[PDB]
């Protein structure tokens, strides 16, 4: 019958509403701060992987690049640890808001998650609505907004990329 990508996306939108990040954030300052750190950690993680994969495919060493985004993460207010002179924020890994959206949609509409491309597309869509939902949590905040942070990391990445071919 129906069952389209739209049906699944709307369902993830329904699930995002159920978790209500904004309301939880407004009632519990610890939830809010954790959310901000988690979100900025996801932006870090995505850019780390995208650029590292590129650099490596181009035969470049990733160390100096990791060192720089590490400092950017550090200056963004993300706690972490240093190894081999490279700082890695502790929150880097799996976006805690993605799984509830993705695990629920896969459970409800498993046939729509068999295709690898579809899986990726749904994940990307989940990241997007999550980013939109959390934006106001960074209003009048010392930490950079996810948008500013992503831009900070991209510029860094672009500096390494234009020095490779």
């Amino acid at each position: 019958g129906s069952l389209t990508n739209k049906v699944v996306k709307d369902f993830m939108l329904q699930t995002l509403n159920d978790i209500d990040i904004r309301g939880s954030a407004s009632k519990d300052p610890a939830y809010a701060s954790q959310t901000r750190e988690a979100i900025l950690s996801a932006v870090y993680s995505k850019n780390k992987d995208q650029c590292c994969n590129l650099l490596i495919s181009k035969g470049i060493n990733i160390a100096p690049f990791l060192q720089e985004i590490g400092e950017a993460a550090k200056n963004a207010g993300l706690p972490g640890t240093t190894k081999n002179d490279v700082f890695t924020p502790s929150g880097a890994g799996a976006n805690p808001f993605i799984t509830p959206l993705i695990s629920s949609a896969n459970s409800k509409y498993p046939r729509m998650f068999i295709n690898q491309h579809q899986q990726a597309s749904f994940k990307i869509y989940a990241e997007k609505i999550i980013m939109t939902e959390v934006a106001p949590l960074f209003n009048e905040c010392a930490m950079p907004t996810p948008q500013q942070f992503q831009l900070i990391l991209e510029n860094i990445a672009n500096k390494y990329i234009q020095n490779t071919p």
Binding site: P79, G93, A94, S103, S107
Partner: protein, 178 residues
């Protein structure tokens, strides 16, 4: 058609992401191990029926006590991971992880998973633990804790060599359908 939701929990730096990647790509990611695990829905045929094994990482959430539970609903099986060369991570299985998942999912089975077993006999790793008056966790020691915490069973693996890797998930599936 049928689904199984598996969630991997445990202290940071225990190799959760690595073992998930190593298992879904079927090869250790040499030189570069991605920070984000992407193969969350593994399709597999079980008992003659089509299934999707939903795999979910929790890496980077060890200090997000307010966000962590968001991943728990409808979980059919948990993998409580600890590194056999990390006594603190092992102790946290009892002090933190099992208490947390048991609270949110009292009826969900869990497997105790020992990771990084390839490092157990590594001279440099062994000497760092000794300098701290500690020794790597043996499976006998781990099996005692798995018994104490009522885990379905104890299993260990190496994301690097993949020894025991597949068995870990076969067991998870069994536990989930048990």
């Amino acid at each position: 058609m049928q689904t199984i939701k598996c969630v991997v929990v445990g202290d940071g730096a225990v190799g959760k992401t690595c073992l998930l990647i190593s298992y879904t790509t079927n090869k250790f990611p040499s030189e570069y191990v991605p920070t984000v695990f992407d193969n969350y829905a593994v399709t597999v045929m079980i008992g003659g029926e089509p299934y999707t094994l939903g795999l979910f990482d929790t890496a980077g959430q060890e200090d997000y006590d307010r966000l962590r539970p968001l991943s728990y609903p409808q979980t059919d099986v948990f993998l409580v991971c600890f590194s056999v060369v990390s006594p603190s991570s092992f102790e946290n299985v009892k002090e933190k992880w099992v208490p947390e998942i048991t609270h949110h999912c009292p009826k969900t089975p869990f497997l105790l998973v020992g990771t990084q077993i390839d490092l157990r006999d590594d001279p440099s790793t062994i000497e760092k633990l000794a300098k701290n008056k500690q020794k790597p966790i043996t499976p006998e020691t781990a099996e005692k804790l798995a018994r104490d915490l009522k885990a379905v069973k104890y299993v260990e693996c190496s994301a690097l060599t993949q020894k025991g890797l597949k068995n870990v998930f076969d067991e998870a599936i069994l536990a989930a359908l048990e």
